[PDB]
Scaffold this active site. Structure first.
Site, mmCIF file in Angstrom:
data_model
loop_
_atom_site.group_PDB
_atom_site.id
_atom_site.type_symbol
_atom_site.label_atom_id
_atom_site.label_comp_id
_atom_site.label_asym_id
_atom_site.label_seq_id
_atom_site.Cartn_x
_atom_site.Cartn_y
_atom_site.Cartn_z
ATOM 1 N N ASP A 164 0.849 -1.178 0.000
ATOM 2 C CA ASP A 164 0.000 0.000 0.000
ATOM 3 C C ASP A 164 0.884 1.227 0.000
ATOM 4 O OD1 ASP A 164 -2.552 1.440 0.366
ATOM 5 O OD2 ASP A 164 -1.649 1.946 2.366
ATOM 6 N N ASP A 178 1.129 5.048 0.578
ATOM 7 C CA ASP A 178 0.507 6.193 1.177
ATOM 8 C C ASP A 178 1.315 7.489 1.091
ATOM 9 O OD1 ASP A 178 -1.505 4.441 1.800
ATOM 10 O OD2 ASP A 178 -0.981 4.339 3.865
ATOM 11 N N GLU A 186 1.643 11.167 0.928
ATOM 12 C CA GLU A 186 0.866 12.346 1.275
ATOM 13 C C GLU A 186 1.647 13.654 1.049
ATOM 14 O OE1 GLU A 186 -1.100 11.562 5.150
ATOM 15 O OE2 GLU A 186 -1.357 9.453 4.497
ATOM 16 N N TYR A 243 -11.827 11.708 5.294
ATOM 17 C CA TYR A 243 -11.821 12.131 6.702
ATOM 18 C C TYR A 243 -10.778 13.229 6.826
ATOM 19 C CZ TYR A 243 -8.607 7.979 6.490
ATOM 20 O OH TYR A 243 -7.617 7.082 6.139
HETATM 21 C C1 LIG Z 1 -4.265 12.086 14.784
HETATM 22 C C2 LIG Z 1 -3.475 10.877 14.400
HETATM 23 S S1 LIG Z 1 -4.050 9.509 14.806
HETATM 24 N N1 LIG Z 1 -2.340 11.079 13.748
HETATM 25 C C3 LIG Z 1 -1.453 10.027 13.324
HETATM 26 C C4 LIG Z 1 -1.272 10.126 11.816
HETATM 27 O O1 LIG Z 1 -2.099 9.789 11.162
HETATM 28 C C5 LIG Z 1 -2.707 10.034 9.888
HETATM 29 C C6 LIG Z 1 -2.118 9.179 8.745
HETATM 30 O O2 LIG Z 1 -0.713 9.287 8.695
HETATM 31 C C7 LIG Z 1 -2.823 9.345 7.387
HETATM 32 N N2 LIG Z 1 -2.579 8.096 6.728
HETATM 33 C C8 LIG Z 1 -3.516 7.267 6.682
HETATM 34 C C9 LIG Z 1 -3.276 5.925 6.054
HETATM 35 S S2 LIG Z 1 -4.961 7.709 7.334
HETATM 36 C C10 LIG Z 1 -4.331 9.312 7.657
HETATM 37 O O3 LIG Z 1 -4.802 10.009 8.768
HETATM 38 C C11 LIG Z 1 -4.182 9.690 9.970
HETATM 39 C C12 LIG Z 1 -4.959 10.452 11.031
HETATM 40 O O4 LIG Z 1 -5.291 11.719 10.566
HETATM 41 O O5 LIG Z 1 -0.133 9.379 11.479
HETATM 42 C C13 LIG Z 1 1.093 9.775 12.003
HETATM 43 C C14 LIG Z 1 2.174 8.993 11.290
HETATM 44 O O6 LIG Z 1 2.137 9.201 9.927
HETATM 45 C C15 LIG Z 1 1.038 9.464 13.482
HETATM 46 O O7 LIG Z 1 2.242 9.662 14.215
HETATM 47 C C16 LIG Z 1 2.781 9.150 15.100
HETATM 48 O O8 LIG Z 1 2.357 9.787 16.295
HETATM 49 C C17 LIG Z 1 2.568 9.136 17.537
HETATM 50 C C18 LIG Z 1 2.189 10.011 18.723
HETATM 51 O O9 LIG Z 1 0.785 10.298 18.844
HETATM 52 C C19 LIG Z 1 4.030 8.779 17.675
HETATM 53 O O10 LIG Z 1 4.283 8.150 18.922
HETATM 54 C C20 LIG Z 1 4.503 7.955 16.504
HETATM 55 O O11 LIG Z 1 5.866 7.665 16.665
HETATM 56 C C21 LIG Z 1 4.236 8.705 15.223
HETATM 57 N N3 LIG Z 1 4.479 7.767 14.134
HETATM 58 C C22 LIG Z 1 5.364 8.019 13.165
HETATM 59 C C23 LIG Z 1 5.551 6.994 12.073
HETATM 60 S S3 LIG Z 1 6.203 9.302 13.118
HETATM 61 C C24 LIG Z 1 -0.153 10.201 14.101
HETATM 62 O O12 LIG Z 1 -0.373 9.779 15.416
HETATM 63 C C1 LIG Z 2 -10.056 18.594 3.124
HETATM 64 C C2 LIG Z 2 -8.577 18.559 3.260
HETATM 65 S S1 LIG Z 2 -7.760 18.551 1.949
HETATM 66 N N1 LIG Z 2 -8.048 18.536 4.487
HETATM 67 C C3 LIG Z 2 -6.620 18.536 4.716
HETATM 68 C C4 LIG Z 2 -6.243 17.390 5.627
HETATM 69 O O1 LIG Z 2 -6.172 16.251 4.814
HETATM 70 C C5 LIG Z 2 -4.872 17.576 6.295
HETATM 71 O O2 LIG Z 2 -4.720 16.742 7.438
HETATM 72 C C6 LIG Z 2 -4.279 15.769 7.153
HETATM 73 O O3 LIG Z 2 -4.958 14.682 6.566
HETATM 74 C C7 LIG Z 2 -4.057 13.683 6.114
HETATM 75 C C8 LIG Z 2 -4.752 12.747 5.154
HETATM 76 O O4 LIG Z 2 -5.750 12.086 5.901
HETATM 77 C C9 LIG Z 2 -3.586 12.947 7.339
HETATM 78 O O5 LIG Z 2 -2.740 11.936 6.883
HETATM 79 C C10 LIG Z 2 -2.846 13.933 8.223
HETATM 80 O O6 LIG Z 2 -2.540 13.391 9.491
HETATM 81 C C11 LIG Z 2 -3.541 15.268 8.388
HETATM 82 N N2 LIG Z 2 -2.444 16.214 8.593
HETATM 83 C C12 LIG Z 2 -2.439 16.865 9.725
HETATM 84 C C13 LIG Z 2 -1.446 17.871 10.173
HETATM 85 S S2 LIG Z 2 -3.570 16.513 10.637
HETATM 86 C C14 LIG Z 2 -4.632 19.029 6.714
HETATM 87 C C15 LIG Z 2 -3.197 19.313 7.095
HETATM 88 O O7 LIG Z 2 -3.218 19.887 8.390
HETATM 89 O O8 LIG Z 2 -4.981 19.934 5.702
HETATM 90 C C16 LIG Z 2 -6.364 19.846 5.424
HETATM 91 O O9 LIG Z 2 -6.638 20.893 4.529
#
Ligand SMILES: CC(=S)N[C@H]1[C@H](O[C@H]2[C@H](O)[C@H]3N=C(C)S[C@H]3O[C@@H]2CO)O[C@H](CO)[C@@H](O[C@@H]2O[C@H](CO)[C@@H](O)[C@H](O)[C@H]2NC(C)=S)[C@@H]1O
Ligand SMILES: CC(=S)N[C@@H]1[C@@H](O)[C@H](O[C@@H]2O[C@H](CO)[C@@H](O)[C@H](O)[C@H]2NC(C)=S)[C@@H](CO)O[C@H]1O
Length: 539
Positions: free
Chosen positions: A288, A290, A292, A367
């Site tokens: 997969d 991902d 972003e 979302y």
């Molecule tokens: C609010 C949340 S749950 N954020 C986590 C974040 O999530 C995104 C995700 O990357 C994006 N990809 C999808 C597939 S669905 C989409 O949306 C979710 C939620 O919005 O992902 C981060 C990593 O990419 C998370 O980070 C980690 O945070 C925790 C602390 O809360 C930390 O302990 C970990 O080490 C971090 N992981 C890393 C790989 S840096 C984030 O929680």
């Molecule tokens: C409607 C849109 S385009 N909202 C974006 C939002 O996606 C962003 O957020 C992030 O969402 C991605 C994809 O789900 C997620 O992986 C990330 O964790 C979110 N990034 C955060 C910092 S929460 C957001 C960026 O802040 O921008 C909105 O405009």
């Protein structure tokens, strides 16, 4: 007379075709792939003639033979197929063969062929469904969820999924390459350490302890070759042979390296490393992606190029050709998927009508439409439709699906996303007609693990009593809770908004539903995904 009956000597009985070095932090030294496990067996003969040939039998079949020259012997031999084997030493002469009692030995391999199935009962409110809709039902499990969130692979309601996605596999790279990790304490240094001696743009494992070594149910014995998330996923596969378990590469903080893949040297290196990763970790069913996001607007404000769309399509094409070649070598079906922005502005940076020809599924990230990252403009974070008060709302599920469909993406490829968490604000004020979303906020809501985000589990158990209003917006298909005294506002998915998503998926002949993230659900969200897509109840 036939020879005396040999006794198997006490000694190690667990061996590995892919060995994990127990004192190494660099992925290249941590994981050693061999063509076969090196097995050793010793024996003593306490009574009778030692015979003239000694044999090691595995399920009756000879794995080694040699001269029997004394009262004690040792055999070192190779075993190229994983399994638990009934191993005997037999001593033979011209007058017969005398076999020891069997001792079970373990020859570990990353398909989990050596593991008892991990078949655990459903927990919390999870109810059993059969996967008979032909629709995708996916969720992400996060590698780091084993710590504070204490959610391990044995707690996954695995019978209720067709796809389990593992967040996240990182791509190696230091300064300039994984700078988004630096915002997370210790995270950038953990990747450098894992990637020591390893070329940039190759996949690695971000937390090798959590993935391979942390003791977990089914993999708690010190000599178990695989423990942690991967060891349990291996045993999970044994329990659920048709579950697709996909490694997810990227995510919010690990996407920076994709932005360099317009260089085919780096892209080829990445694809080859993915191939090797799947050859190494046999329990995974594809990959997969991902990223972003193509075009930027991800975590890193300095990345994003107009070339990214073209890079994305080339990457999917090349990953598909690598997977087709792996399917042919192994005879298995491999899947190629990608989680993507649901925003039309990001969707239009990529020709998904072209990339779909390489991909099994598109996981539409419908979302995070709104949240505490914007205190001025409030809205439903995961709604199906626009709300009555702003029918021209840009970020909705239907706008994301319609953008893909308008490109020419086939509806069957599109997997609609649901959130197992809410986003929210505090101090909301200045709103009209009892619609809190029409106001403005002064900060993020107090979160379960991080500000502005609440596990659906906590919403259901903590924020549906006392002063909390609860409203289901039937136009948007979107629930919200609100506490006017503090102005706390939370936007989330519930059983009902999920049911509306599932009905919509069926209506429009889309591919199914997926969710982020599995640890945050109490079962309500996933039960509803399953029911609304028409899966039947019962084991
Ligand atoms: C609010 C949340 S749950 N954020 C986590 C974040 O999530 C995104 C995700 O990357 C994006 N990809 C999808 C597939 S669905 C989409 O949306 C979710 C939620 O919005 O992902 C981060 C990593 O990419 C998370 O980070 C980690 O945070 C925790 C602390 O809360 C930390 O302990 C970990 O080490 C971090 N992981 C890393 C790989 S840096 C984030 O929680
Ligand atoms: C409607 C849109 S385009 N909202 C974006 C939002 O996606 C962003 O957020 C992030 O969402 C991605 C994809 O789900 C997620 O992986 C990330 O964790 C979110 N990034 C955060 C910092 S929460 C957001 C960026 O802040 O921008 C909105 O405009």
């Amino acid at each position: 007379a036939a020879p005396g009956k040999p006794t198997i000597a006490w000694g190690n009985t667990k061996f590995a075709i892919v060995e994990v070095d127990q004192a190494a932090t660099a992925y290249n030294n941590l994981v050693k792939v061999k063509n076969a496990a090196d097995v050793s067996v010793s024996w003593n003969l306490w009574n009778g003639d030692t015979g003239t040939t000694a044999k090691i039998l595995l399920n009756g079949k000879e794995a080694w033979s040699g001269p029997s020259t004394g009262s004690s012997g040792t055999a070192n031999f190779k075993v190229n197929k994983g399994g638990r084997y009934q191993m005997q030493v037999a001593l033979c002469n011209a007058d017969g063969c005398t076999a020891s009692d069997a001792t079970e030995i373990v020859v570990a391999d990353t398909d989990g062929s050596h593991l008892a199935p991990l078949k655990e009962p459903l927990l919390e409110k999870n109810k059993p469904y059969k996967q008979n809709s032909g629709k995708v039902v996916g969720s992400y499990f996060v590698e780091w969820g084993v710590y504070g969130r204490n959610f391990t692979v044995d707690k996954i309601p695995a019978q209720n999924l067709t796809h389990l996605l593992y967040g996240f596999i990182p791509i190696c790279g230091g300064n300039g390459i994984n700078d988004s990790l630096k915002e997370i304490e210790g995270s950038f240094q953990a990747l450098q350490r894992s990637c020591q001696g390893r070329e940039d743009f190759k996949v690695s494992i971000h937390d090798p302890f959590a993935a391979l070594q942390k003791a977990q149910k089914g993999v708690t014995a010190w000599d178990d070759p695989y423990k942690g998330n991967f060891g349990q996923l291996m045993a999970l596969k044994q329990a659920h042979p048709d579950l697709k378990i996909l490694p997810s590469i990227g995510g919010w903080t690990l996407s920076d390296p994709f932005f360099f893949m317009g260089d085919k040297v780096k892209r080829d290196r990445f694809v080859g490393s993915v191939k090797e990763f799947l050859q190494t970790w046999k329990f995974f069913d594809g990959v997969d992606i991902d990223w972003e996001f193509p075009g930027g607007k991800g975590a890193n404000p300095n990345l994003g190029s107009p070339q990214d769309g073209e890079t994305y399509v080339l990457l999917m094409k090349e990953l598909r050709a690598m997977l087709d070649q792996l399917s042919a070598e192994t005879g298995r079906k491999y899947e190629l998927t990608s989680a993507i922005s649901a925003g039309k502005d990001k969707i239009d940076k990529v020709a998904y009508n072209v990339a779909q020809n390489s991909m099994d599924h598109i996981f539409l990230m419908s979302y995070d439409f709104y949240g505490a990252f914007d205190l001025k403009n409030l809205g439903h974070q995961t709604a199906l439709n626009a709300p009555a008060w702003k029918p021209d709302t840009a970020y909705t599920t239907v706008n994301g699906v319609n953008a893909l469909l308008t490109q020419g993406v086939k509806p069957g490829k599109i997997v609609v996303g649901t959130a197992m968490y809410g986003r929210g604000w505090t101090g909301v004020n200045g709103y009209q007609n009892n619609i809190p979303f029409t106001g403005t906020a002064t900060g993020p809501v107090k979160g379960t693990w991080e500000n502005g985000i609440v596990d659906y589990r906590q919403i259901a158990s903590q924020f549906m009593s006392g002063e909390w209003q609860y409203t289901y917006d039937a136009t948007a298909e979107a629930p919200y809770v609100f506490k006017p005294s503090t102005g706390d506002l939370i936007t989330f998915d519930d059983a009902r908004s999920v049911q509306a998503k599932g009905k919509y998926v069926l209506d429009k002949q889309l591919g199914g539903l997926f969710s982020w993230e599995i640890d945050a659900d109490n079962g309500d969200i996933l039960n509803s995904m399953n029911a609304s897509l028409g899966n039947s109840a019962g084991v």
